[PDB]
Write a protein that binds this ligand. Structure first.
Ligand SMILES: Cc1ccc(NC(=O)c2ccc(CN3CCN(C)CC3)cc2)cc1Nc1nccc(-c2cccnc2)n1
Ligand SMILES: CCCCCCCCO[C@@H]1O[C@H](CO)[C@@H](O)[C@H](O)[C@H]1O
Length: 329
């Protein structure tokens, strides 16, 4: 067991192994210098991990999730620790990842992208997503500030305005969503990268749905067939502004294939939305698409998700996960 040390930061007690030095708060996440490796790291101290049942499950969910992600386009776990010598002391959890230089927002402000940047950047997201999706994990909150990019235009997916990127079925509250909610988002992100501006800058969610509907159009028979509620079906029709544009005239100076890919991602009907795996093979990624370098996830046991347990059991589960962690090489 390493030796620990205490520090008060922006009115909060951080205690970490001395391995991590020079903590400085970026937002409760500090940047720190991992002296084992000389690399800058990010340290998250989970707020009130075991305060309620809901908190306890999320603590656990995030640990499991971080312990599973092992792909170059997705954030991974360097370290997890607790200053606690035992289960009974266990009340803090800290997670460690690579520190990130920039997110997609920063890249946006700082340089105007080549077509070739947009291809390489979206390619990485999709390759990340084919790996998340293959584990039956749905991101749900893809947006530029959750995409980290280094100096070589390499990208990692993480999770820390969200709605600009949300699939419309989420904003119309179905209890059941599939993985292609994440593809809606990728298309919102791509569009932004090519156009320089936000595709649906909605003041509120109904504003969002309106902008969506005038660009992609009102749903086909085939999709109206799948909506059970008359109220829903009426409400949707109730938009209802100046018609399905052109789409292609919103992106006029862009690469014809980019625009084609975007047409297959920004499909109202999530049954018809292109998947990450299919999107990988779309001609717009001809420069990067390598079929033998696009791996899928190991089996991932999320039977815990359906489970309703006591704080202490969630706290115990989380403790086993902490104790059994194996650092990467
Ligand atoms: C230190 C840490 C601990 C945990 C996480 N967690 C995650 O990144 C994550 C990734 C994917 C998911 C996927 N997921 C599936 C289900 N749902 C609903 C969404 C979540 C969730 C959390 C990130 C980090 N890293 C992190 N977080 C925020 C900011 C920074 C950071 C800040 C500044 C400079 N460099 C890095 N670094
Ligand atoms: C206002 C524009 C939004 C129209 C409704 C979005 C259509 C979303 O698509 C729907 O996704 C569901 C969610 O899992 C699936 O069950 C349905 O099969 C699919 O058609």
């Amino acid at each position: 067991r390493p030796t620990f040390y205490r520090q008060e930061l922006n009115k909060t007690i951080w205690e970490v192994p001395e391995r991590y030095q020079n903590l400085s708060p970026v937002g409760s996440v500090c940047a720190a210098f991992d002296t084992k490796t000389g690399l800058r790291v990010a340290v998250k101290k989970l707020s009130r991990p075991f305060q309620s049942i809901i908190h306890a499950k999320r603590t656990y969910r995030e640990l499991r999730l971080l312990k599973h992600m092992k792909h170059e386009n997705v954030i991974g776990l360097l370290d997890v620790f607790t200053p606690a010598r035992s289960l009974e002391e266990f009340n803090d959890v800290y997670l460690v990842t690579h520190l990130m230089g920039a997110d997609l927002n920063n890249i946006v402000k700082c340089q105007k992208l080549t077509d070739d940047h947009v291809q390489f950047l979206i390619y990485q997201i999709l390759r990340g997503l084919k790996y998340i999706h293959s584990a039956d994990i749905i991101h749900r909150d893809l947006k530029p500030s959750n995409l980290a990019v280094n100096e070589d235009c390499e990208l990692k997916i993480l999770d820390f305005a969200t709605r600009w990127y949300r699939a419309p079925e989420i904003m119309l509250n179905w209890m059941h969503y599939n993985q292609t909610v994440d593809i809606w988002s990728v298309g919102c992100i791509m569009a932004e990268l090519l156009t320089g501006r936000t595709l649906f800058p909605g003041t509120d969610h109904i504003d969002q749905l309106k902008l969506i509907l005038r660009l992609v159009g009102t749903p086909g028979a085939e999709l109206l067939k799948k909506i059970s509620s008359e109220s829903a079906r009426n409400y949707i029709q109730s938009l209802t502004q100046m018609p399905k544009m052109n789409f292609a005239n919103v992106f006029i100076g862009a690469n014809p294939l980019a625009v084609d890919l975007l047409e297959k991602m920004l499909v109202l009907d999530s049954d018809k939305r292109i998947t990450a795996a299919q999107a990988l093979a779309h001609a717009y990624f001809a420069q990067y698409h390598d079929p033998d370098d696009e791996p899928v996830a190991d089996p991932y046991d999320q039977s815990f998700e359906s489970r309703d347990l006591l704080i202490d059991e969630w706290k115990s589960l989380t403790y086993d996960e902490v104790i059994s962690f194996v650092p990467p090489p």
